[PDB]
Design a protein around this ligand. Structure first.
Ligand SMILES: NC(=O)c1ccc[n+]([C@@H]2O[C@H](COP(=O)([O-])OP(=O)(O)OC[C@H]3O[C@@H](n4cnc5c(N)ncnc54)[C@H](OP(=O)(O)O)[C@@H]3O)[C@@H](O)[C@H]2O)c1
Ligand SMILES: NC(=O)c1ccc[n+]([C@@H]2O[C@H](COP(=O)([O-])OP(=O)(O)OC[C@H]3O[C@@H](n4cnc5c(N)ncnc54)[C@H](OP(=O)(O)O)[C@@H]3O)[C@@H](O)[C@H]2O)c1
Ligand SMILES: NC(=O)c1ccc[n+]([C@@H]2O[C@H](COP(=O)([O-])OP(=O)(O)OC[C@H]3O[C@@H](n4cnc5c(N)ncnc54)[C@H](OP(=O)(O)O)[C@@H]3O)[C@@H](O)[C@H]2O)c1
Ligand SMILES: NC(=O)c1ccc[n+]([C@@H]2O[C@H](COP(=O)([O-])OP(=O)(O)OC[C@H]3O[C@@H](n4cnc5c(N)ncnc54)[C@H](OP(=O)(O)O)[C@@H]3O)[C@@H](O)[C@H]2O)c1
Lengths: 354, 354, 353, 354
């Protein structure tokens, strides 16, 4: 019937989305709220509920418990949105104790035996678990979801690359504060200011996009991914949720904006075909107004709110270049929501027992 | 020997920069402050001094006077930052009454006998005045300055186009509130939001960049400007001053980021050679840190604060593509400061008598 | 099963009528009216500056003219119209026989028009009968007070009912939505605080006084004429939520702990009658010294946005306490208060099925 | 001759104001710039210049030096804006080495032998230095300046208390981000939010106000300060500088707002009588418009920008109650500026030699 989940980092900006979404989930229960600094306290009392609505009634009085595999014989699934550096070793201890771990943290994203999973783009990479368990000599496993900023690009770019001779994408991002966590970005960095994130962050963004694109099954074979040029210039400003990206996308041969638009509108993959509960009907929603999408108004779009990437502004720049913009909800699709969708995919494929 | 200026729209976001800058100018005097709504009242009491420092002491008691040429016998120069639509015909009346008019308004920016002037890029186009006067059959003249957002791009792009085989620039802008004037942008459009300006504004921005580039004297001759692809995706957020732009610039042939960076660092033009009072020593300042320029910290940079375009983040994307960002103070270089510098060039060239 | 028209349906108040009536057990949002936007699909023109998404069965409705003759089938008019335009329009609707629940200022001081906070002065709906006879109309007008006045008068009314309150000195830090759209320019509030000025301060206390003058008290000291009120009002860059700091003085020694229990226990006719939009706790009291906060508490309560959230109850001296209050300015402060008033009027037989 | 100052915490939000103001001071030079983390590096490269203008050119290349009494033989004055906890003992080490220490830190604010100094209000309390040197057995001394929030209230309240039977003041504050320092207040605490500071901060505020008021020499003797009731409810929002306060002020007997207004307009103290360089002409500036003062427009008011408290909105509430508002620049008057003014007074009264 129902799987009992633990949410690690349950009070954090990603944790609250697991709590919110799992409270309404048909078969995965938020059964165990883990923390460190606030172990012992009622969740409703200490959480910064920086998201829609209010802490779920049935969750407010639940006690925050230790992050300890041995206290968790009763848990079936581990969701892990832990800070970088701390996540890595914890997620291994859970896998070594036999748990399926779905991680939103960066630590394991480039391990060659760990899926870097966007369920609509590279669902077959869950097969990596087999080799992982064998070589790591553990009975559980780790899957990761990618950097939210990498997903806001990789989703529409992956859709495009599957059917077109895309040879470059040159990206500018304007990301929200919640992507940095709490305390995260100091207020003085973003009041009357735009904070560039710097070369390191630009680089890791395209690095993750390349891995995700390398794992997409294409309908055309040109150009080779090695010959695709990607670049990002990334920034944070004083928005709460929603990462906005402007993409100039180039092609090896003449490509019509209107054909690419239809490809984006019609985009679907295995989560849709399988009818997974958290799969949006329209993982890419395309808007036609020239002032949409906007962060405030469109970050909760779609039949599963916050699970759809919202694209718009599709326009021919020249015969071999188009402009589009994309908006992703950074803690729903970009983190917890993609993590729950991944869990549903793993359950359906037989990797996690119901 | 000195000149008396009138400042039309003196209380507006551009007008206050003319007031602030001219209060210290060695020879152009802010003598007549014009307006519509508050005519009769002291300047200091009606103005929203949304800029550095305080209303100048010898200005605050000056009365706001009508915009009427028949009241203006004693004035030598008109500065005109009037709204789109209202500006065109008023600017014509002033020219017909014999006044030199330096306008920051869009209305005359594409008249082929009217200069669209960035003093460092196309100073020779002041020559259009001779034909203008003949054909319009007036004794005065109109000179315009370009859209601030177009200058933020055209200054660095013009310096590059001069010396390199630039064949494309793909731009994303993150502009400040003050560019829209007052009441300008509603607060609800920009709190926890990014506001795209739309296809019209994107189109007019590149149209102005094309006209400016078409008038830059190049040291190379490939490609022809007709084969350069330009595109912009423009937005406003809740910054007060400073327009921030991300430029991906492509070349016809292999081109080194470090060479382009030196061309930018070394950029100077006729305003520097002439030592005009408002000419920055470094019309383009290059920063090397991967988190600079930042809007709050770098919008008043330079020996003439706010007159320099600040570029940074220079980086190779691939052999034929570089990334850079630029920051322009939208009401100093982008409007009043550019206008004062234009006037200084016209005075020095004998178009305005001293 | 009653049909409502929502006037000003695309406005910051109108979107709350649409959001809340979409799921109401018995009042259906049947007609969306406008001015500039008439003839367009509601979903295409609306700035949905509120939680969630435009309700699907409302997004496809066509915005219709604000015209009393075109509304044969409607039982209730909700009227969040601009000051000046509101007055005459609301009169035409009452004249045509419609119950008119108004959030606009125009009629708020007419002595035959309720200025209604359902938990504080529900008996003033009685004014309607004399209203209908003297104005000679079959419909009627009821108004809801200024959101800022409600943020103060709800907790001040609960206190005034049971304690010898003789003063309240108020500072407000109000949200941008209170001014509507285009409303407040962005340059007035970025890196700034915008005082609203003497007129707004004066109208806030004038409304509070009329409300307090209509509260049924359990004590009789001091007389209201001897109560001193003052407000200093401001807006900042918050989206919804009006936040108020109140220093409240009393004629005699009064315990903050007792006043805190009175606020926690406060209930009125809406709660007694179990009206669908009546919150269980019209006043919610928080204990943390950093709460309420605008972002986190403005949607509090079993009916989200309908409760006034109070906190920071503290003894200043024997005859003075400090508290703060937070009201959702378009839910409790406008449309949600309006809907609760409608349910009260239905229950009391003033609006017929 | 000039006095050579050391500025501790030179790169902080208070440090930058010492740097800016001392750069133009007639006789106190910013000679030694101290730090901890950034020791060794050029000041210009590491500072966040979150203030007006730019880092002074003669300062930019100065190296940040260790906070160590032994390196400072050449130093005549120490300005100390160090974090609470760390300041106490350090400021003691400097005084023990014979240095005059002007502190903005809270640590010694309530030592009964250490002045808690607002130069216009309690200038005679510098006398405390004599007992201080004797009892502590040190050649130097410590003087503190008060919490900026407390100064915003105590300046107007002290001018009133001097001449009226004031018996209560009930204060609400709306404070800026820079008052918390950097990284200071998290962005997520203030975007679309108001952050209450809590009971502790409300109490320390009135505790400091009482000490200040108790040291004001009055012209009336009722009521006794022990019988005055003070309360504050404090908050921060997303403003950069400037603390705004609403005060309801009660009196034991009938008192006219217009009379109190004139008292405020006319306020002056020893700093003005002595013509100290950093003493504003009008330490309280009174505005008449019912929408002034406003944080952005009035935080730099006055002939010494940022050194005047700006009051407005004077209004009769009842015969014994008035309402006013005050705005203080929190790092100028509220910190460095008041600190420099204290220094000038201490030099003028002969506590600091030359
Ligand atoms: N936010 C996004 O948009 C986003 C998107 C995708 C992925 N992610 C990733 O998800 C992770 C968390 O992000 P966030 O934004 O939610 O961070 P955050 O708001 O700073 O949350 C930190 C949370 O983790 C807990 N925690 C910290 N250290 C721990 C430890 N050593 N052991 C157990 N629990 C610990 C804390 O609990 P206590 O307070 O009880 O100690 C807190 O609940 C990061 O790796 C981030 O990169 C972020
Ligand atoms: N802001 C920028 O970044 C920027 C940069 C480049 C150029 N510009 C251009 O400069 C112009 C002004 O922009 P702004 O940002 O300064 O606008 P703003 O703040 O809205 O001010 C407009 C001013 O013009 C006056 N005015 C309006 N209509 C007039 C009329 N018919 N006759 C005479 N005076 C009139 C008003 O004076 P009263 O209120 O006393 O009537 C007001 O002071 C626009 O065309 C704009 O596109 C703006
Ligand atoms: N906002 C609050 O917090 C709040 C709270 C309490 C009460 N109120 C009151 O409620 C009223 C509405 O406020 P708001 O904040 O919703 O304003 P808003 O967002 O500016 O909305 C104005 C609305 O009224 C319509 N409208 C304008 N003029 C009209 C006319 N002559 N005839 C018919 N419809 C007209 C507009 O429709 P078109 O766009 O189709 O022209 C629009 O839907 C005001 O009286 C306000 O004082 C506001
Ligand atoms: N901001 C205001 O409005 C305001 C007003 C009045 C009073 N104050 C007081 O002034 C003090 C500083 O506040 P701020 O707002 O300027 O803080 P801030 O911006 O965080 O600055 C802290 C500064 O102190 C230095 N520092 C930190 N620990 C140190 C140590 N152990 N030894 C030596 N230096 C150390 C740091 O330099 P490195 O990083 O190079 O080590 C940094 O330059 C506080 O006590 C505050 O209460 C502030």
């Amino acid at each position: 019937r129902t799987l009992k989940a633990a949410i690690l980092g349950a009070t954090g900006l990603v944790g609250i989305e697991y709590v919110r979404m799992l409270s309404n989930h048909p078969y995965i229960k938020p059964a165990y709220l883990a923390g460190k600094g606030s172990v012992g306290k009622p969740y409703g009392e200490v959480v910064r509920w920086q998201t829609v609505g209010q802490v779920p009634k049935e969750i407010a009085d639940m006690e925050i418990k230790p992050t300890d595999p041995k206290l968790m014989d009763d848990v079936d699934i581990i969701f892990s949105p832990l800070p970088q550096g701390a996540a890595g070793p914890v997620e291994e201890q859970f896998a070594k104790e036999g748990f399926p771990v779905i991680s939103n943290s960066p630590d394991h994203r480039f391990d060659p035996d760990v899926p870097l999973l966007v369920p609509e783009l590279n669902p077959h990479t869950i097969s990596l678990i087999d080799e992982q368990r064998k070589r790591r000599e553990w009975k559980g496993f780790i899957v990761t979801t990618p950097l939210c900023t990498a997903q806001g690009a990789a989703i529409p770019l992956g859709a495009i690359f599957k059917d077109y001779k895309m040879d470059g994408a040159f990206i500018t991002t304007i990301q929200s504060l919640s992507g940095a966590g709490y305390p995260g970005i100091p207020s003085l960095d973003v009041v009357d200011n735009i904070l560039p994130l710097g070369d390191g962050y630009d680089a890791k963004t395209i690095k993750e996009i390349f891995r995700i694109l390398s794992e997409v099954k294409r309908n055309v074979d040109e150009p080779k991914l090695e010959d695709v040029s990607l670049a990002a210039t990334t920034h944070r400003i004083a928005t709460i949720h929603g990462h906005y990206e402007v993409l100039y996308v180039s092609f090896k041969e003449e490509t019509a904006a209107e054909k690419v638009k239809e490809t984006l509108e019609n985009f679907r993959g295995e989560p849709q075909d399988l009818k997974l509960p958290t799969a949006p009907s329209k993982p890419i929603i395309v808007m036609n107004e020239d002032t949409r999408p906007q962060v405030y108004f469109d970050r909760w779009a779609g039949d599963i709110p916050g699970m759809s990437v919202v694209v718009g502004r599709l326009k021919q720049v020249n015969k071999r270049m188009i402009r589009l913009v994309s908006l992703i909800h950074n803690t729903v699709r970009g983190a917890a929501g993609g993590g729950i969708l991944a869990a549903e995919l793993l359950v359906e494929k037989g990797y996690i027992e119901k």
